[PDB]
Amino acid sequence: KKNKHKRKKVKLAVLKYYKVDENGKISRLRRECPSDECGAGVFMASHFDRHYCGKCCLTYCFN
């Protein structure tokens, strides 16, 4: 009986969530956090239908 392998992590590079254009540009690509706990830092996710906050466990079913 074969064992279960563990959760091998995905090991990605740098974040690169930031756009920059015309020598100095502000654009917040991923969505905001309405919680005051993780505001102005933590983004939300981008799944195929939803955005999700990795800290405050909050999602929006954008349907």
Partner RNA sequence: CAUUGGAGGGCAAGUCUGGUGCCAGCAGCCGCGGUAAUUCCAGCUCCAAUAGCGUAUAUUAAAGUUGCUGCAGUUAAAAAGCU
Partner RNA sequence: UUGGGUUCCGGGGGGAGUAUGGUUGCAAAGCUGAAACUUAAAGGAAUUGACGGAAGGGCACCACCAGGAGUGGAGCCUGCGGCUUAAUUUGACCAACACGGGAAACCUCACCCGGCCCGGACACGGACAGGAUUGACAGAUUGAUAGCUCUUUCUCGAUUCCGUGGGUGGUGGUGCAUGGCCGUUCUUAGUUGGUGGAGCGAUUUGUCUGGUUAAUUCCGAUAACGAACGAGACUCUGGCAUGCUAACUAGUUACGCGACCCAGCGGUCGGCGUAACUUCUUAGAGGGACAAGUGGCGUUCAGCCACCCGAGAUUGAGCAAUAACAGGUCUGUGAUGCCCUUAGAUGUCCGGGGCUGCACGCGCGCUACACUGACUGGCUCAGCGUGUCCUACGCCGGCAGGCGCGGGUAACCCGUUGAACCCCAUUCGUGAUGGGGAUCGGGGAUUGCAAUUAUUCCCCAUGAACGAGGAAUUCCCAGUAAGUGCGGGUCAUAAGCUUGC
Pick one of Zn ion, RNA, none as the site partner of residue 56 (Cβ within 5 to 8 A by kind): Zn ion
Which amino acid, one-letter code, is at 29? Answer: L
Least Å distance between CB 24 and RNA?
21
Least Å distance between CB 12 and Zn ion?
21
Which of 2, 59, 7, 12 shows the shortest CA–CA distance to 33? 59
The widest CA-to-CA distance across the chain, in whole angstroms, is 59
Residues that bind RNA (CB under 7 A): 1-11, 13-15, 17, 30, 41-48, 50, 52-55, 57, 59
